[PDB]
Amino acid sequence: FLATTLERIEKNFVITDPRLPDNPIIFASDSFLQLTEYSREEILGRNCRFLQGPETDRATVRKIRDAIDNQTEVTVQLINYTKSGKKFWNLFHLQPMRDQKGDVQYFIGVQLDGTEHVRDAAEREGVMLIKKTAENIDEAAKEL
């Protein structure tokens, strides 16, 4: 699956379609593929939960479930795994994308990878970056 211009935006993100069974990934940027080690054909049509593994905090996963069910934004940190099983920390931001009547049409997820759980200045700078990125992608996705 060749990258669309959207997917060549130089940021780590995915877009899912909550109309399709299990809210699957339909767009995944090249940097997301580089991070996770999967090809685009391997992850399209799958729910993002395949990135989770034994050390993933399930309490945090439930925070994300609740955000999606209530169609609201969330920002959390959790451990995720690459295809080859390497752990990374994921500073993750979710937000819905709404149409001209205000209904959610897609979800946008922005991921910032790190080697540790961040706090204080590193957390603040991380969250500044992922929120700004989410806004950029919301604009890009308006024409999908």
Ligand X SMILES: *[C@@]12=NC3=[C]C([C])=C([C])[C]=C3N([C][C]([O])[C]([O])[C]([O])[C]OP([O])([O])=O)C1=NC(=O)[N]C2=O
Residue 129 half-sphere exposure toward CB, CA atoms < 13 A: 15
CA dihedral 20, 22, 23, 27 (to 10 degrees): -80
Q: Strands 74-81, 25-28: parallel, antiparallel or unpaired by DSSP?
A: unpaired
Residue ranges of E strands in the chain:
13-16, 25-28, 74-81, 87-98, 104-114
- 55-74 footprint of ligand X as x/- string (CB under 6 A): ------x--xx--x------
Taking the complex as a whole, how short is the minimal distance between the CB of residue 73 and ligand X, in angstroms?
Answer: 11
Q: Using CB under 6 A, pick the residue from 49, 117, 124, 132 that binds ligand X.
A: 49
Q: How far is the CB of 85 from ligand X (least distance, A)?
A: 14
Q: Which is nearer to ligand X, 90 or 121 (CB)?
A: 90
Report strand pairing: 25-28 vs 13-16: antiparallel
By CB under 6 A, tell whether 14 contacts ligand X: yes
Residue 136 binds ligand X (CB under 6 A): no
The footprint of ligand X (CB under 6 A) covers: 14, 16, 23, 47-49, 51-52, 61, 64-65, 68, 80, 90, 92, 94, 107-109, 111
